[PDB]
Structure 1
Amino acid sequence: ASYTVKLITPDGESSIECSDDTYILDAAEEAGLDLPYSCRAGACSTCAGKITAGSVDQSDQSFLDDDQIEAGYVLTCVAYPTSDCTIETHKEEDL
């Protein structure tokens, strides 16, 4: 399956198509957007986003604690979409 991912950045709002087996960051880069990252391995907060609608599979994330997850934080570099979703990007500073 493929999902529509709406991305709300500090510049504005976009929507990209992202397969269920593509990470959200990778999908965003393919489209041509410039979202933040460092490790690309789920071990930092560089790529942090906040999901407001929809769901992901971020099973390989290892940086966010349970409360940060509850609040909607996602590590876009290891997050696959599992539905159409909306993710506010550039959220590291929240952490």
Structure 2
Amino acid sequence: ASYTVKLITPDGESSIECSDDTYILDAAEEAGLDLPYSCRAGACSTCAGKITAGSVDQSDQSFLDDDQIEAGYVLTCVAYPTSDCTIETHKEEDLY
């Protein structure tokens, strides 16, 4: 289970279900492009999850995550409960 739903990085559709916390670019962006999560908001743009619509950060607080509990749009590389992960175009390095 876990790590299986859908994501999309330089390696388009990736599988992620994070039914055990995590999801972070590590699940996808690292499954094929290795990129740990730490820089924190205001430090990078690699974690631009486009509609994570899955991993529920929960501990958003001041740190960026999902806006409140469902929005990969922000740096969601530090979520908490993860009811399925859905990050598309987490960061195409262009922002079409």
In the alignment, what sits opposite 2:81?
81
Structure 1 contact 23–80 (Cα < 8 Å) conserved: no
Structure 2: where are the runs of 5+ without partners? none
Deviations 1:67-92 (Å, cap 9, x if unpaired)? 89887513132134521231113448
Report the RMSD for the aligned CA atoms in angstroms: 4.5
Going from structure 1 to structure 2, the CA distance change for 1:64 and 1:17 (only over 3 Å counts) comes to: closer
Structure 1 contact 56–81 (Cα < 8 Å) conserved: yes
Aligned residues: percent identity? 100
Deviations 1:36-64 (Å, cap 9, x if unpaired)? 86715686543121126434215246465
Q: TM-score, normalised by structure 2?
A: 0.53
SS of 2:52's partner is: strand
Structure 1 contact 24–76 (Cα < 8 Å) conserved: yes
Structure 1 contact 48–75 (Cα < 8 Å) conserved: yes
Structure 1: where are the runs of 5+ without partners? none
More strand by share: 1
Between 28-37 and 77-86, the greater mean CA deviation after superposition: 28-37
